[PDB]
Ligand binder design. Structure first.
Ligand SMILES: Cc1nccn1-c1cccnc1
Ligand SMILES: Cc1nccn1-c1cccnc1
Lengths: 266, 266
């Protein structure tokens, strides 16, 4: 991987692995989401940021960036053995937080095969308290971001910024008692953000997966699932097929995530 | 990746990813096991096998399934490090085949790990194990070294030791483990690496935090179906810590795997 000529974005190529593909012999959305995370980490490392991407003031004040929203749209899933090229960049969104965007391309054709956008908010890693971005922190990372806006989803009033409602009981479908194993944790022993995508998808009926391709997934992150927590995944059809999703703790029913998926007939 | 000069083995380099590492910032044994599977698949593809089956195997609806996996790691590669893996196959007469691997640090050329696996022929539909016919054995022998080449040559080596059945009550357990879609391969079967993760789930976190896994030997007796539920059982048998393991279906207690692990103090 490498920073582009201007040093304001980063590119990396990936050959899709045998274990990374599903029943259609193309990369799963969880493989795509792991590749997005990987290119994001390699971009942070290439410009001086460390197991977290933090500025100097963030380390001093015990602050971390945490995902608030992930939105991904795939037009073509790369096949096993194919080379996919991913470009990523960060943008400041004033004191609300930061945004990390991605464009996916087929390496042979140069054609855009997917795009993603993610909203990140600042939080104290000890008290878990959300904060707005201080001027000192904002000034420490702005020189690594494009100054003029660069958006993976430019269109005014597009899918990436739509408000998601809370699924009401009874859910049409459910997958209960989901628990993370050690492979679901990252190097800091936190549940990987991609695991939540998998858990959301667990309550989609197998018949939908067998006859449809996932086109869009928007996921809100409200609370983290601890290593010893148990989760219930709920799905209701709102419609192409569209679904409304909810992940909550199995016991008290505390919300951890909410989302929507859009699927196209194969 | 590429076949070596003589065409009797295959080599591939991998850069260890951010999400592939554990709390020590080095690759997990499950990352290692996925890399072994990937280089094995790339070797089969490079010589004309596309499941890795011969022509007669396709005609008779036969597949190779894992009977045993044995892995020894001296050093786990760190995040961002390049690991080089060499793999080859060997005929073991009518019993089945063996796939072996050597792992090296790309910068130093030093052997950092080694693995060996035993495969048996099985009918895809009836699930009936069988010996290798001469017609099948003659179709793959020209792709294997004729003289023996062993990753574990030694006279009394750990890779071929008989594993006993854990007796109830187990010292430790992790109950109700279920596979999600990310645990399945392109043929909708549970990936062989998932069983390694499930075995490790019943090891206490304190052992994982103070020890490094040196050796794991796993026998595969029966497959876990997509809708099955598993219980993982562990009993200490032992400066080094050794454990005996058993995976069985949560309901009837039907054995799916048995194994042993050896851990050394950090
Ligand atoms: C670490 C950080 N905080 C806000 C933005 N970034 C950043 C910018 C460029 C590349 N990698 C990370
Ligand atoms: C397909 C097969 N059956 C037994 C061994 N092999 C083989 C040989 C060489 C490379 N890849 C697989």
């Amino acid at each position: 991987g490498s920073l582009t000529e201007d040093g304001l974005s980063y590119k990396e190529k990936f050959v899709v692995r045998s274990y990374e593909v599903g029943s259609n012999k193309t990369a799963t959305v969880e493989t795509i989401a792991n590749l997005l995370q990987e290119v994001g980490c390699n971009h942070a490392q290439s410009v001086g940021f460390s197991g977290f991407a933090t500025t100097t003031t963030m380390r001093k004040l015990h602050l971390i960036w945490v995902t608030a929203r992930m939105h991904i749209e795939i037009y073509k899933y790369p096949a096993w053995g194919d080379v996919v090229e991913i470009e990523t960049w960060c943008q400041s969104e004033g004191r609300i937080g930061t945004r990390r965007d991605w464009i996916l391309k087929d390496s042979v054709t140069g054609e855009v095969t997917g795009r993603a956008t993610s909203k990140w908010v600042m939080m104290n890693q000890d008290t878990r308290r959300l904060q707005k971005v201080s001027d000192d922190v904002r000034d420490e990372y702005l020189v690594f971001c494009p100054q003029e806006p660069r958006l993976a989803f430019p269109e005014e009033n597009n899918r990436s910024l739509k408000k998601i409602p809370k699924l009401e009981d009874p859910a049409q479908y459910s997958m209960i008692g989901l628990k993370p194993r050690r492979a679901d944790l990252d190097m800091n022993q936190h549940v990987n953000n991609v695991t939540y995508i998998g858990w959301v998808l667990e309550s989609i009926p197998q018949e939908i997966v067998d006859t449809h391709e996932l086109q869009v997934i928007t996921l809100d992150y409200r609370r983290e699932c601890q290593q010893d927590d148990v989760v219930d995944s709920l799905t209701t059809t709102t419609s192409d097929s569209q679904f409304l999703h909810l992940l909550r703790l199995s016991g008290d029913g505390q919300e951890i995530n909410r989302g929507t998926t859009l699927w196209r007939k194969k």
